[PDB]
Amino acid sequence: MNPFHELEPGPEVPEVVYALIEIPKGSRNKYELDKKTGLLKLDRVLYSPFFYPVDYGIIPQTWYDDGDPFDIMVIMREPVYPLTIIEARPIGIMKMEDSGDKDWKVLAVPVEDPYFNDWKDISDVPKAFLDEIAHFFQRYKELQGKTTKIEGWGNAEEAKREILRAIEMYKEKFG
């Protein structure tokens, strides 16, 4: 029972996808779905006193250029628990490379929080909030000798194209 393989990418792809959350906002512990058992695993404790600024996880049945499930960041007011599924509306995409392939990350809002009803595109997000997320990813591995370049942000349409591409990559890899 590995929810990464068992759940479909979403109920109305790519307008609404499922986000399987691994890390709640506010966590300094970096969790991930164990590849084998699908249990939650501690990947590492961040080397710096930083916390995930968003609920962070993966879209089920996706694969990406970086050889991982496609990352998704969901803006939740109250963080969820790890392994919670959220119906999420993609509104943009963070463009970054940590190495050699794209490690881009979808930015999304919960469909079922009315607070975010008018958040439909990247332009709807407060600039300082985008800058805080980009900064987190730019620096959170700095003490691990890792450097990352944030290229910028793409819009909702680009996010949705990339989601479809990641769904196709998963089908091509696993069938």
Choice between 6 and 161, CB closer to a second copy: 6
Q: Tell which positions 36-65 bind a second copy, by CB under 8 A.
A: 37-45, 47-53
* 103, interface contact from Mn ion, a second copy, none, CB < 5-8 Å by kind: Mn ion
* Separation between Cα atoms, residue 38 and residue 40, nearest integer Å: 7
Contact characters 40-79, Mn ion, x per CB under 5 A: --------------------------x-x--x--------
Contacts of 157 (CB under 8 A, 6+ apart): none
Q: What residue type is 37 in one-letter code?
A: T
Q: Which one of 18-26, 39-47, 100-108, 164-172 is the stretch in contact with Mn ion (CB under 5 A)?
A: 100-108
Contact 27, 19 (CB under 8 A): no
Q: Tell which positions 69-128 bind a second copy, by CB under 8 A.
A: 76-78, 80-87, 110, 112-118, 126-128
Burial of 31 (0-12, 13-18, 19+ CB in 10 A): buried
Contact 90, 163 (CB under 8 A): yes
38 φ/ψ sector (left φ>0, alpha ψ -120 to 50, else beta): left
Choice between 66 and 87, CB closer to Mn ion: 66
Residues at the site binding a second copy, with contacts judged by CB under 8 A: 1, 3, 6-7, 20, 27-29, 31, 34, 37-45, 47-53, 76-78, 80-87, 110, 112-118, 126-129, 131-133, 135-136, 139, 142-143
